[PDB]
C-alpha cells in the first residue's frame, strides 16, 4: 500500500523522527493510520498517533471509530501488511512485529473485511 505520509516525507526524515520519538518515549510507539484506497468510509482527521505500548488493538479501534464518527453498524477494519490484527494484541506487540525501517507502524483502515476488495 502507498501511504501518503511516506510519499510526502523522504525515508531519512521519517527514520530520524521515528528513532527520536522511540528513544524519547520508550513505552510508546508511533503509528500512522490512513484510509485504504477505494474504501467507502469517513475520513480520519489525524494520521499520526503516539500510542502506549500496552494499549490493545481493540482499544485503538474504539478510539479511531469515534474519531471518524462511525455509527455502531458501520464496519471498521485495520490492516497491517494486508492482515487484520487481533483485538487482544497490544499495540506494542503489533509494532514490534511489523514496524517499518523508519520506526513507524503503518495501519490502513477500511469498511471492508478484506484489503483491496
Amino acid at each position: 500500500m502507498k501511504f501518503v505520509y511516506k510519499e510526502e516525507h523522504p525515508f531519512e526524515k521519517r527514520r530520524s523522527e521515528g528513532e527520536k520519538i522511540r528513544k524519547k518515549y520508550p513505552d510508546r510507539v508511533p503509528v500512522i493510520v490512513e484510509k485504504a484506497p477505494k474504501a467507502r468510509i469517513g475520513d480520519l482527521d489525524k494520521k499520526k498517533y503516539l500510542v502506549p505500548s500496552d494499549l490493545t488493538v481493540g482499544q485503538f479501534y474504539f478510539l479511531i471509530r469515534k474519531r471518524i464518527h462511525l455509527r455502531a453498524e458501520d464496519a471498521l477494519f485495520f490492516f497491517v501488511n494486508n492482515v487484520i490484527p487481533p483485538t487482544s494484541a497490544t499495540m506494542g506487540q503489533l509494532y514490534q512485529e511489523h514496524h517499518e525501517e523508519d520506526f513507524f507502524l503503518y495501519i490502513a483502515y477500511s469498511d471492508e473485511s478484506v484489503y483491496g476488495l
Binding site: 508511533p30 489525524k46 499520526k48 498517533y49 500510542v51 502506549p52
Partner: peptide
C-alpha cells in the same frame, strides 16, 4: 504533530 493516545 502527534495525537497523544492514553490508556482508558
Amino acid at each position: 504533530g502527534w495525537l497523544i493516545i492514553d490508556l482508558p
